[PDB]
């Protein structure tokens, strides 16, 4: 089954998921000089004050923090979006070294990791229906660079020891995702896809310009997780990122000049 190894990594995915070679795949390189400023784009509206986190899970490819999405508690609106998108989970992609890890790149620059806050369009009723629609998901992408620690991330880092291996989960309540946002909400946006199988082309990507900084010690703890289940041979969970895909017939728009 698929993964990030030499024998099952992204270059192999198309054999089981032919849409991997599709017209609106993600991630992409953001060429800052070719992106188009669009004055018609609205500011993002992030309403996370009533967010209810439930659980943190190692699913064998990353760790996910899951939220209660049975009501409009944590929602994303505005920007390029029509309607209301509910937060369902966030996760990260990261590297084995500080010079790599992000999925998106900016003028070919890679960051140490990338945070994805995944939201689904409420008009489709559930997440499973949403992924079948071209406007079904909105994913907010935030870059991480190594520098000073991010206090708001430390609660996540401290629980990782309890979900070291695939399939382990832990109760993870009262986490406030607002502590993971940068100061500015300036963004680029383009139409794209999930970056893991099944690679469905259902995502409006919103990638923030401003990275957040985390400390070397914080990212080091991500790299101690395992792809494998308990009792299996240890494989460190690192480099769980898909390389940039061709832009083809898409334009990246910027909310700022
Ligand atoms: C269930 C779920 O959320 N699946 C996802 N697959 N890829 C995602 S990402 N890397 O594009 O945010 S989210
Ligand atoms: Zn992701």
UniProtKB/Swiss-Prot annotation:
Residues where Phosphoserine is found: 162, 169
Phenotype upon changing residue 62 to F: Reduced activity
Recorded GO CC terms: apical part of cell; cytoplasm; cytosol; extracellular exosome; myelin sheath; plasma membrane
Active-site residues, record numbering mapped to chain: 61
Site (Involved in the binding of some activators, including histamine and L-histidine): residue numbering on this chain: 89
Manner of cofactor binding, per the entry note: Zinc. Can also use cobalt(II) with lower efficiency, but not copper(II), nickel(II) and manganese(II).
Pfam families linked to this entry: Carb_anhydrase
Result, substituting residue 91 to C/D/E/N/Q: Strongly reduced CO(2) hydrase and p-nitrophenyl acetate esterase activities, impaired stability of zinc binding
Subunit and interaction comment: Interacts with SLC4A4. Interaction with SLC4A7 regulates SLC4A7 transporter activity. Interacts with SLC26A6 isoform 4 (via C-terminus cytoplasmic domain).
Family from the record: Belongs to the alpha-carbonic anhydrase family.
Disorder this protein is connected to according to its UniProt record: Osteopetrosis, autosomal recessive 3: A rare genetic disease characterized by abnormally dense bone, due to defective resorption of immature bone. Osteopetrosis occurs in two forms: a severe autosomal recessive form occurring in utero, infancy, or childhood, and a benign autosomal dominant form occurring in adolescence or adulthood. Recessive osteopetrosis commonly manifests in early infancy with macrocephaly, feeding difficulties, evolving blindness and deafness, bone marrow failure, severe anemia, and hepatosplenomegaly.
Other information: Target of drugs used in treatments against glaucoma disorder and breast cancer.
Descriptive protein name: Carbonic anhydrase 2
Organism: Homo sapiens
């Amino acid at each position: 089954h698929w993964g990030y190894g030499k024998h099952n990594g992204p270059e192999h995915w198309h054999k089981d998921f032919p849409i991997a070679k599709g017209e609106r795949q993600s991630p992409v390189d953001i060429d800052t000089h070719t992106a188009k400023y669009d004055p018609s784009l609205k500011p993002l509206s992030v309403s996370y004050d009533q967010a209810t986190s439930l659980r943190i899970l190692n699913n064998g490819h990353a760790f996910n923090v899951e939220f209660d999405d049975s009501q409009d508690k944590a929602v994303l609106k505005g920007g390029p979006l029509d309607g209301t998108y509910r937060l369902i989970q966030f996760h990260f992609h990261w590297g084995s070294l500080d010079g790599q890890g992000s999925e998106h790149t900016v003028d070919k620059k890679k960051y140490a990791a990338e945070l994805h806050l995944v939201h689904w369009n409420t008009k489709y009723g559930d997440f499973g229906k949403a992924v079948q629609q071209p406007d079904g998901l909105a994913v907010l992408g935030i870059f991480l660079k190594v520098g000073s620690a991010k206090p708001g991330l430390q609660k996540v880092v401290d629980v990782l020891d309890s979900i070291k291996t695939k399939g382990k989960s832990a109760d993870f309540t009262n986490f406030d995702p607002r502590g993971l946002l940068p100061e500015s909400l300036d963004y680029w946006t383009y139409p794209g896809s999930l970056t893991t199988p099944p690679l469905l082309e259902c995502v409006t990507w919103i990638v923030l310009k401003e990275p957040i900084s985390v400390s070397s010690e914080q990212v080091l703890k991500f790299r101690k997780l395992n792809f494998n289940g308990e009792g299996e041979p240890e494989e460190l969970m690192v480099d769980n990122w898909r390389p940039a895909q061709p832009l083809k017939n898409r334009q990246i728009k910027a909310s700022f000049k």
